[PDB]
Curated annotation (Swiss-Prot):
Histone H3 reader that is required for the ATAC complex-mediated maintenance of histone acetylation and gene activation. Component of the ATAC complex, a complex with histone acetyltransferase activity on histones H3 and H4. It comes from Homo sapiens (Human). Disulfide bonds: none annotated. Coiled coil: none annotated. This is ZZ-type zinc finger-containing protein 3. Residues 36-59 bind DNA. The lineage of its organism: Eukaryota, Metazoa, Chordata, Craniata, Vertebrata.
Length: 75
């Protein structure tokens, strides 16, 4: 289906696939911050934060899009 898509400032297939993997290698823990820090370090290009936000639209954007991800927006 999707088979990839375009994006002005969206991740790149290269990273996309990378993260997905790192996610498995790096399991959850008490602190979610430290978690992203580890993965990001591996990526080299991305950062804890950048990775954190991505995760949101990776796990939350799966529950039949039932959970609110955004609200007051435009454009």
């Amino acid at each position: 289906g999707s088979s990839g898509s375009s994006g002005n400032q969206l991740w790149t297939v290269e990273e996309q696939k990378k993260l997905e993997q790192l996610l498995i290698k790096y399991p959850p823990e008490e602190v979610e911050s430290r978690r992203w820090q580890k993965i990001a370090d591996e990526l080299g290009n991305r950062t804890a934060k950048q990775v954190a936000s991505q995760v949101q639209k990776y796990f939350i954007k799966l529950t039949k899009a039932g959970i609110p991800v955004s609200g007051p927006s435009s454009g």
